[PDB]
Amino acid sequence: PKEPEQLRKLFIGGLSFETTDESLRSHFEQWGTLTDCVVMRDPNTKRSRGFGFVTYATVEEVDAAMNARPHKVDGRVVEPKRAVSHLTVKKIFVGGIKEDTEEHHLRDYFEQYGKIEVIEIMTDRGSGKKRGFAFVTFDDHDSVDKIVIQKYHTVNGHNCEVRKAL
Template structure:
């Protein structure tokens, strides 16, 4: 069927809904099959899709796969029941995101700290807590202020006791807090960004090779824009270093995507 202006938004909406219902399962035993993967995750609900990713030539398992539930509530139930063990091996479930997001810096890292931008002067800590505690248990909340004037600098951090709330919040992208649109991202340290690059080299190649699989591990449109150095550090010296690392990581990731296309 030919795509029209009407069908494209519908396809995008359907795709977004699927993203919320899909889990990446890493650390699978090479003996795990689609059947054993399905049997394990069906304890939390109905699966609409289940796949173990394999090498096209040898058909050997690559050690990861995907399961798609029929509802977001089933995904939440599965993630709340961690740790997961399949065929005698503890696996690593994470919320999946679209393939086009996988090459962005931070997409391959799990963190417990969330950056929140767009904080206005009338937004207080309790507004952030009231909104984000629905996603999980909060450890700390910090709204960054100017050291001299005491005025809010427009951003803050929310730290959870687990990475899954951060993954879910970033996946949903659009949030309104105290009547204002908020920008949310993972808060990455320099070390986490370096680890992300190492994983990205492998992940980007795998994803581009498997044309039929269009969902992979988690979302972050990390800071390459002006002022985005504040995502990770609050001091000027550390922020400058972060910009340099972010720019380098973005260039390398872009080159990787070009190489595998």
């Protein structure tokens, strides 16, 4: 069936106050079918609040829209983000990797979510032994947002716990 609607929405911040439901839709329809598209406005003045949201038919369409950033909508670069599960960060904690998980295990898996800048496999300050967790830093927050909404992460045969970090 259909992916949950929450996972198909993009919050668009930084809109030009002249962007309308129609111009936001015409822009974002380039990357998929939009089932919803709304500019948020003041209830009394009708003046734009400078943000809005679009809902795609599928998660792959959300991905396509995010991969097409930066988006310049009505002359202004906007800020799309997936809906809250916003804690906008570029780093994840990866736990449950035990002592046999290496850098290449984490890189080969996580590189398909985004461009990796740092992998830090955590070791004991006294003994140097691996502690069984790591941090991965990406160049952009959407990688992290995709990662943390998955129910499961399997890396090196381990079922891992993944959370946003700082």
